[PDB]
Amino acid sequence: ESIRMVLIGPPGAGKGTQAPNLQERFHAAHLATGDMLRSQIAKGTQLGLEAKKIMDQGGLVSDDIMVNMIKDELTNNPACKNGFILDGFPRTIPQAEKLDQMLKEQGTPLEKAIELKVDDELLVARITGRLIHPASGRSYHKIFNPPKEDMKDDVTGEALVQRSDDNADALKKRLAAYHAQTEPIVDFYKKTGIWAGVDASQPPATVWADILNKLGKN
């Protein structure tokens, strides 16, 4: 129950769905930069308000902002001493290089980078059917993964919402940004030898068993 890892995948691939599994199993901290940004928006902070406009256009928030955010969480979040699951970070080559240097100075290098590979065609249905519980970050899908109490988060009973960047127009922008900016990082980790690919087109429990097999832990 110590892992230091990155989850990489296109929008809707399943990072947020699998992260709880990894978190349970390894008692690692789940560091999800999308959720962090959405917290900023919810607190109504100036960073949150300017990030929202970029997020809804399917753009990427500045590397400087994102690196600083993660630097602080690694440094002064106690939970990141067990290990951590990075979800949505790094998202660009500069973020990947700077993370590399941060973890070198701390002497705690990444063990695995798991790519959740899934064709883009499948991603539209996942995005447009998604409901989230804003408070926990938990995602459901109207077709593929329903709440038992529909439109209600099961674990709190609290209402589910749609994400404001979860539409086909923004998603086209999101997918392009992923192929242009994020997908090069997979090669970076291939060169460092910590990459493993997973078939994220399978259903959740099957992807999870695939991830466990690929972490060398099952």
Ligand X SMILES: Nc1ncnc2c1ncn2[C@@H]1O[C@H](COP(=O)(O)OP(=O)(O)OP(=O)(O)OP(=O)(O)OP(=O)(O)OC[C@H]2O[C@@H](n3cnc4c(N)ncnc43)[C@H](O)[C@@H]2O)[C@@H](O)[C@H]1O
Residues taking part in catalysis: 15, 91, 130, 163, 174
Q: Do the annotations mark residue 17 as ligand-binding? A: yes
Task: Note whether 91 binds ligand X by CB under 6 A.
Answer: yes
CA dist 149 and 105 (Å) reads 47
Q: Work out how close the CB of 35 gets to Mg ion at its nearest, in angstroms, rounded to a whole number.
A: 7
Question: Does 14 engage in binding with Mg ion (CB under 5 A)?
Answer: no
Alpha-carbon gap, residue 44 to 9, rounded angstroms: 28
* 130 has binding-site annotation: yes
Q: Is 140 annotated as a binding residue?
A: yes
Q: Is 202 labelled a binding residue?
A: yes
Binding of Mg ion by 10 (CB under 5 A):
no
CB-based contacts of 180, cutoff 8 Å, min separation 6: none
Window of 107-115, 147-155, 184-192, 202-210 that interacts with ligand X by CB under 6 A: 202-210
Q: Give the distance between the most distant pair of CA atoms in the chain.
A: 47
Structure tokens at 4: 């230091």
Which residue type occupies 165?
D
DSSP string, 66-115: HHHHHHHHHHH-GGGGT-EEEES---SHHHHHHHHHHHHHHT----EEEE
Residue stretches of the annotated binding site:
12-17, 33, 38, 59-61, 88-91, 95, 130, 139-140, 163, 174, 202
Residues that bind ligand X (CB under 6 A): 9, 11-17, 33-34, 37, 54-55, 59-61, 66, 88-89, 91, 95, 126, 129-130, 139-141, 144-145, 174, 200, 202-204, 207
